[PDB]
Amino acid sequence: PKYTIVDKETCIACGACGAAAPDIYDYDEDGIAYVTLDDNQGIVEVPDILIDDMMDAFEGCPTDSIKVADEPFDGDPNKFE
Ligand code: SF4
């Protein structure tokens, strides 16, 4: 499976990821992206049909703030660093 999460500390509120994958990423009041599937906890598996959109958003993020993994993040966007 695949899991995703936003490191909100490095996000620059550019708007690209919600356009590339609107069913996965949205923005808080401050314009900072988060994963709507699981309230940015990195615990809900991304549906198979959405993986291509997720990878588009991941590759397109200017500051490498979107994370992807094959194992849950359990709330920590920096788990795999
Ligand atoms: S693409 Fe990256 S920097 Fe831009 S809003 Fe999404 S997470 Fe933030």
What's the CA angle centered on 75, arms 77 and 40, to 5 degrees? Answer: 80
Q: Give the tokens for residue 59.
A: 């590759």
Which residue from 8, 26, 29, 63 has its CB within 8 A of the most atoms of ligand 1, so it is best to mutate? 63
Backbone angles phi, psi at 20, to 5 degrees: -75, -35
Residue ranges of E strands in the chain: 3-6, 25-27, 33-35, 66-69
> Using the 8-state DSSP alphabet, how is residue 35 labeled?
E
* Sign of the dihedral defined by the CA atoms of residues 35, 36, 42, 48, in that order: negative
Q: Which atom of ligand 1 is nearest to the CA of 15?
A: 5
What was the structure determination method? Answer: X-ray
Q: In angstroms, what is the resolution?
A: 1.5
Q: Are 42 and 77 in contact (CB under 8 A)?
A: yes
User: Which residues share a beta bridge with 5?
Assistant: 67
